[model samples]
Target: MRITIYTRNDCVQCHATKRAMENRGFDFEMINVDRVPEAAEALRAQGFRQLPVVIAGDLSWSGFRPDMINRLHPAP
Candidate 1:
Protein backbone atom coordinates (compact mmCIF):
# COMPACT_ATOMS: atom_id res chain seq x y z
CA MET A 1 0.00 0.00 0.00
CA ARG A 2 1.20 3.49 -0.79
CA ILE A 3 0.72 6.15 1.89
CA THR A 4 1.11 9.88 1.44
CA ILE A 5 0.68 12.60 4.04
CA TYR A 6 0.06 16.26 3.20
CA THR A 7 1.44 18.45 5.99
CA ARG A 8 2.79 21.83 7.04
CA ASN A 9 5.41 22.94 9.53
CA ASP A 10 4.40 23.76 13.15
CA CYS A 11 1.17 21.73 12.85
CA VAL A 12 0.60 19.78 16.03
CA GLN A 13 -1.83 17.33 14.46
CA CYS A 14 0.55 16.76 11.60
CA HIS A 15 3.35 15.96 14.03
CA ALA A 16 1.11 13.65 16.02
CA THR A 17 -0.08 11.81 12.94
CA LYS A 18 3.43 11.38 11.58
CA ARG A 19 4.64 10.14 14.95
CA ALA A 20 1.80 7.65 15.16
CA MET A 21 2.60 6.25 11.73
CA GLU A 22 6.30 6.05 12.57
CA ASN A 23 5.63 4.31 15.87
CA ARG A 24 3.55 1.77 13.98
CA GLY A 25 6.51 1.18 11.65
CA PHE A 26 4.72 2.53 8.62
CA ASP A 27 6.74 4.22 5.90
CA PHE A 28 5.03 7.11 4.15
CA GLU A 29 5.81 10.07 1.92
CA MET A 30 5.26 13.57 3.31
CA ILE A 31 4.45 16.69 1.28
CA ASN A 32 4.85 20.00 3.09
CA VAL A 33 2.59 22.82 1.88
CA ASP A 34 5.13 25.55 2.68
CA ARG A 35 7.88 23.72 0.83
CA VAL A 36 5.68 22.98 -2.16
CA PRO A 37 3.03 25.43 -3.26
CA GLU A 38 1.31 22.84 -5.39
CA ALA A 39 0.62 20.72 -2.33
CA ALA A 40 -1.59 23.38 -0.79
CA GLU A 41 -3.49 23.82 -4.04
CA ALA A 42 -3.96 20.10 -4.36
CA LEU A 43 -5.45 19.95 -0.89
CA ARG A 44 -7.72 22.85 -1.69
CA ALA A 45 -8.86 21.18 -4.89
CA GLN A 46 -9.88 18.19 -2.84
CA GLY A 47 -11.99 20.56 -0.69
CA PHE A 48 -9.86 19.92 2.36
CA ARG A 49 -8.93 23.03 4.33
CA GLN A 50 -7.34 21.04 7.15
CA LEU A 51 -3.69 20.13 7.47
CA PRO A 52 -2.35 16.57 7.51
CA VAL A 53 -4.42 14.95 4.82
CA VAL A 54 -3.58 11.26 4.57
CA ILE A 55 -3.98 9.17 1.46
CA ALA A 56 -3.66 5.41 1.55
CA GLY A 57 -4.29 3.79 -1.79
CA ASP A 58 -7.93 4.52 -2.74
CA LEU A 59 -8.77 5.76 0.74
CA SER A 60 -8.20 9.38 1.76
CA TRP A 61 -9.06 11.56 4.74
CA SER A 62 -8.11 14.81 6.45
CA GLY A 63 -6.57 15.12 9.89
CA PHE A 64 -5.42 12.35 12.25
CA ARG A 65 -7.57 9.23 12.32
CA PRO A 66 -5.55 6.47 13.92
CA ASP A 67 -8.32 3.89 14.00
CA MET A 68 -9.18 4.51 10.36
CA ILE A 69 -5.53 4.25 9.38
CA ASN A 70 -5.17 0.94 11.18
CA ARG A 71 -8.16 -0.52 9.35
CA LEU A 72 -7.20 0.84 5.93
CA HIS A 73 -4.22 -1.45 5.43
CA PRO A 74 -2.47 -4.37 6.99
CA ALA A 75 1.00 -4.10 8.52
CA PRO A 76 3.99 -4.77 6.31
Candidate 2:
Protein backbone atom coordinates (compact mmCIF):
# COMPACT_ATOMS: atom_id res chain seq x y z
CA MET A 1 0.00 0.00 0.00
CA ARG A 2 1.56 3.22 -1.17
CA ILE A 3 0.27 5.96 1.12
CA THR A 4 0.84 9.61 0.30
CA ILE A 5 -0.68 12.66 2.04
CA TYR A 6 -0.84 16.29 0.96
CA THR A 7 -0.92 18.87 3.73
CA ARG A 8 -0.62 22.58 4.39
CA ASN A 9 0.30 24.84 7.32
CA ASP A 10 -1.65 24.43 10.54
CA CYS A 11 -4.33 22.33 8.96
CA VAL A 12 -6.04 20.46 11.76
CA GLN A 13 -7.35 17.68 9.55
CA CYS A 14 -3.92 17.23 8.06
CA HIS A 15 -2.38 17.06 11.48
CA ALA A 16 -5.01 14.55 12.52
CA THR A 17 -4.27 12.45 9.47
CA LYS A 18 -0.58 12.31 10.29
CA ARG A 19 -1.26 11.59 13.92
CA ALA A 20 -3.57 8.74 13.08
CA MET A 21 -1.03 7.21 10.74
CA GLU A 22 1.72 7.63 13.28
CA ASN A 23 -0.36 5.98 15.99
CA ARG A 24 -1.05 3.13 13.62
CA GLY A 25 2.66 2.85 12.76
CA PHE A 26 1.89 3.25 9.07
CA ASP A 27 4.60 4.76 6.93
CA PHE A 28 3.39 7.49 4.62
CA GLU A 29 4.92 10.10 2.34
CA MET A 30 3.90 13.68 3.13
CA ILE A 31 3.91 16.69 0.84
CA ASN A 32 3.09 20.21 1.91
CA VAL A 33 0.89 21.89 -0.71
CA ASP A 34 1.82 25.34 0.52
CA ARG A 35 5.49 24.65 -0.26
CA VAL A 36 5.26 22.39 -3.28
CA PRO A 37 4.17 24.46 -6.29
CA GLU A 38 3.90 21.51 -8.61
CA ALA A 39 2.03 19.49 -6.03
CA ALA A 40 -0.56 22.20 -5.44
CA GLU A 41 -1.31 22.50 -9.13
CA ALA A 42 -1.63 18.76 -9.56
CA LEU A 43 -4.08 18.43 -6.68
CA ARG A 44 -6.00 21.50 -7.80
CA ALA A 45 -6.54 19.84 -11.14
CA GLN A 46 -8.14 16.97 -9.25
CA GLY A 47 -10.66 19.40 -7.66
CA PHE A 48 -9.18 19.20 -4.20
CA ARG A 49 -9.44 22.39 -2.15
CA GLN A 50 -9.17 20.64 1.18
CA LEU A 51 -6.43 19.68 3.60
CA PRO A 52 -5.01 16.25 4.29
CA VAL A 53 -5.60 14.62 0.95
CA VAL A 54 -4.60 11.02 1.38
CA ILE A 55 -3.82 8.72 -1.53
CA ALA A 56 -3.51 5.00 -0.92
CA GLY A 57 -3.56 2.43 -3.67
CA ASP A 58 -6.76 3.14 -5.70
CA LEU A 59 -8.29 5.15 -2.87
CA SER A 60 -7.83 8.91 -2.50
CA TRP A 61 -9.71 11.27 -0.22
CA SER A 62 -9.66 14.80 1.19
CA GLY A 63 -9.89 15.50 4.92
CA PHE A 64 -9.58 13.01 7.78
CA ARG A 65 -10.95 9.79 6.38
CA PRO A 66 -10.77 7.15 9.04
CA ASP A 67 -12.78 4.79 6.85
CA MET A 68 -9.87 4.35 4.46
CA ILE A 69 -7.38 4.25 7.28
CA ASN A 70 -9.29 1.53 9.06
CA ARG A 71 -9.26 -0.56 5.91
CA LEU A 72 -5.47 -0.48 5.68
CA HIS A 73 -4.84 -1.62 9.22
CA PRO A 74 -3.89 -5.10 10.29
CA ALA A 75 -4.03 -3.98 13.96
CA PRO A 76 -3.79 -0.97 16.31
Candidate 3:
Protein backbone atom coordinates (compact mmCIF):
# COMPACT_ATOMS: atom_id res chain seq x y z
CA MET A 1 0.00 0.00 0.00
CA ARG A 2 1.21 3.47 -0.88
CA ILE A 3 0.66 6.27 1.61
CA THR A 4 1.33 9.88 0.83
CA ILE A 5 1.44 12.49 3.59
CA TYR A 6 1.44 16.26 3.18
CA THR A 7 3.13 18.30 5.92
CA ARG A 8 4.64 21.64 6.85
CA ASN A 9 7.41 22.45 9.34
CA ASP A 10 6.55 22.67 13.04
CA CYS A 11 2.98 21.52 12.71
CA VAL A 12 2.07 19.63 15.92
CA GLN A 13 -0.91 17.94 14.32
CA CYS A 14 1.22 16.87 11.39
CA HIS A 15 3.82 15.44 13.74
CA ALA A 16 1.18 13.46 15.57
CA THR A 17 -0.20 12.11 12.30
CA LYS A 18 3.28 11.07 11.21
CA ARG A 19 3.70 9.09 14.40
CA ALA A 20 0.32 7.47 13.79
CA MET A 21 1.36 6.25 10.36
CA GLU A 22 4.66 4.98 11.74
CA ASN A 23 2.89 3.24 14.58
CA ARG A 24 0.93 1.36 11.95
CA GLY A 25 4.23 0.35 10.36
CA PHE A 26 3.31 1.68 6.96
CA ASP A 27 5.98 3.14 4.75
CA PHE A 28 4.89 6.58 3.72
CA GLU A 29 5.99 9.29 1.32
CA MET A 30 6.00 12.68 2.98
CA ILE A 31 5.55 15.89 1.01
CA ASN A 32 6.62 19.18 2.53
CA VAL A 33 4.41 22.00 1.34
CA ASP A 34 7.20 24.53 1.87
CA ARG A 35 9.39 22.67 -0.58
CA VAL A 36 6.58 21.89 -2.97
CA PRO A 37 4.35 24.85 -3.73
CA GLU A 38 2.12 22.64 -5.85
CA ALA A 39 1.34 20.50 -2.83
CA ALA A 40 -0.43 23.35 -1.03
CA GLU A 41 -2.41 24.13 -4.14
CA ALA A 42 -3.35 20.50 -4.54
CA LEU A 43 -4.70 20.35 -0.99
CA ARG A 44 -6.53 23.60 -1.56
CA ALA A 45 -8.11 22.17 -4.70
CA GLN A 46 -9.43 19.36 -2.53
CA GLY A 47 -11.16 21.97 -0.30
CA PHE A 48 -8.53 21.92 2.43
CA ARG A 49 -5.78 24.28 3.50
CA GLN A 50 -4.27 22.25 6.28
CA LEU A 51 -1.25 20.15 7.00
CA PRO A 52 -0.96 16.36 7.49
CA VAL A 53 -3.22 15.51 4.58
CA VAL A 54 -3.11 11.87 3.65
CA ILE A 55 -3.78 9.93 0.47
CA ALA A 56 -3.95 6.20 0.53
CA GLY A 57 -4.72 4.94 -2.92
CA ASP A 58 -7.75 7.01 -4.03
CA LEU A 59 -8.69 7.79 -0.42
CA SER A 60 -7.96 11.35 0.62
CA TRP A 61 -8.24 12.59 4.20
CA SER A 62 -7.42 15.72 6.10
CA GLY A 63 -6.07 15.70 9.66
CA PHE A 64 -7.25 12.70 11.68
CA ARG A 65 -6.47 10.63 14.73
CA PRO A 66 -4.70 7.29 14.41
CA ASP A 67 -7.85 5.39 15.32
CA MET A 68 -9.77 7.20 12.62
CA ILE A 69 -7.13 6.25 10.10
CA ASN A 70 -7.28 2.62 11.16
CA ARG A 71 -11.04 2.63 10.68
CA LEU A 72 -10.55 3.73 7.07
CA HIS A 73 -8.08 0.91 6.37
CA PRO A 74 -8.23 -1.88 8.86
CA ALA A 75 -5.20 -3.99 9.70
CA PRO A 76 -4.92 -7.58 8.62
Candidate 4:
Protein backbone atom coordinates (compact mmCIF):
# COMPACT_ATOMS: atom_id res chain seq x y z
CA MET A 1 0.00 0.00 0.00
CA ARG A 2 1.08 3.54 -0.79
CA ILE A 3 1.20 5.74 2.28
CA THR A 4 1.45 9.52 2.14
CA ILE A 5 1.52 11.84 5.13
CA TYR A 6 0.73 15.53 4.67
CA THR A 7 2.44 17.40 7.45
CA ARG A 8 3.46 20.87 8.57
CA ASN A 9 5.88 22.47 11.06
CA ASP A 10 5.26 22.56 14.83
CA CYS A 11 2.46 20.01 14.62
CA VAL A 12 2.54 17.68 17.60
CA GLN A 13 0.09 15.24 16.03
CA CYS A 14 2.20 15.11 12.87
CA HIS A 15 5.27 14.13 14.87
CA ALA A 16 3.34 11.50 16.82
CA THR A 17 1.80 10.06 13.67
CA LYS A 18 5.17 9.77 11.97
CA ARG A 19 6.69 8.15 15.04
CA ALA A 20 3.87 5.63 15.20
CA MET A 21 4.31 4.70 11.55
CA GLU A 22 8.06 4.41 11.97
CA ASN A 23 7.72 2.22 15.04
CA ARG A 24 5.39 -0.05 13.11
CA GLY A 25 7.85 -0.26 10.19
CA PHE A 26 5.40 1.28 7.74
CA ASP A 27 7.02 3.05 4.79
CA PHE A 28 5.46 6.40 3.99
CA GLU A 29 6.21 9.64 2.17
CA MET A 30 5.83 12.88 4.11
CA ILE A 31 4.88 16.14 2.47
CA ASN A 32 5.78 19.34 4.31
CA VAL A 33 2.90 21.64 3.42
CA ASP A 34 4.52 24.77 4.83
CA ARG A 35 7.68 24.24 2.81
CA VAL A 36 5.70 23.38 -0.31
CA PRO A 37 2.95 25.91 -1.16
CA GLU A 38 1.46 23.59 -3.74
CA ALA A 39 1.03 20.93 -1.12
CA ALA A 40 -0.95 23.32 1.06
CA GLU A 41 -3.12 24.20 -1.88
CA ALA A 42 -3.70 20.57 -2.65
CA LEU A 43 -4.80 19.90 0.92
CA ARG A 44 -7.09 22.92 0.83
CA ALA A 45 -8.57 21.60 -2.35
CA GLN A 46 -9.24 18.34 -0.60
CA GLY A 47 -11.12 20.22 2.17
CA PHE A 48 -8.68 19.24 4.89
CA ARG A 49 -7.13 21.90 7.14
CA GLN A 50 -5.55 19.44 9.55
CA LEU A 51 -1.79 19.29 9.85
CA PRO A 52 -1.32 15.55 9.46
CA VAL A 53 -3.45 14.06 6.70
CA VAL A 54 -2.66 10.39 6.24
CA ILE A 55 -3.49 8.71 2.94
CA ALA A 56 -2.94 4.96 2.77
CA GLY A 57 -3.96 3.64 -0.63
CA ASP A 58 -7.78 4.07 -0.82
CA LEU A 59 -8.04 5.03 2.84
CA SER A 60 -7.44 8.55 4.16
CA TRP A 61 -8.06 10.53 7.32
CA SER A 62 -7.11 13.67 9.26
CA GLY A 63 -5.42 13.98 12.68
CA PHE A 64 -3.63 11.32 14.73
CA ARG A 65 -5.62 8.21 15.55
CA PRO A 66 -3.71 5.20 16.81
CA ASP A 67 -6.67 2.93 16.13
CA MET A 68 -6.71 4.02 12.50
CA ILE A 69 -2.98 3.46 12.24
CA ASN A 70 -3.33 -0.01 13.67
CA ARG A 71 -6.13 -0.79 11.25
CA LEU A 72 -3.99 0.36 8.35
CA HIS A 73 -0.94 -1.60 9.46
CA PRO A 74 -1.73 -4.39 11.80
CA ALA A 75 0.86 -6.02 14.07
CA PRO A 76 2.89 -8.80 12.51
Q: Model 4 Cα displacement at 6 (Å)? A: 0.7
TM-score of each: 0.89, 0.89, 0.84, 0.88
lDDT of 1 by residue, 1-76 (tens): 8899999889998998899998888889999988998988888998997889998888888887888678655756
Q: How do all the candidates rank in terms of TM-score, highest first?
A: 2, 1, 4, 3
Per-residue alpha-carbon lDDT of candidate 4 for residues 1-76, written as tens digits (9 for 90 to 100)? 7889999889999999999999999899999988888988988899997879998867888899898898777446
- How do these models rank on lDDT, best leading? 4, 2, 1, 3
In model 2, what lDDT does residue 17 have?
89
Colliding pairs, model 4 = none
lDDT of each: 0.86, 0.87, 0.80, 0.88
**Two-way TM-score contest, 2 vs 3, winner:** 2
- Candidate 2 lDDT over 1-76, as tens digits, reads 7889999888999999899999899999999988998998998899988888898887888998888787767544
The alpha-carbon deviation from the true structure for residue 38 of candidate 2, after best TM-score superposition, in angstroms, is 0.7
By summed lDDT, the worst window of 10 consecutive residues in model 3 runs over 66-75
Please say which candidate is ahead in lDDT: 1 or 2.
2
Give the number of the best model, judged by lDDT: 4
Clashing pairs in 1: none
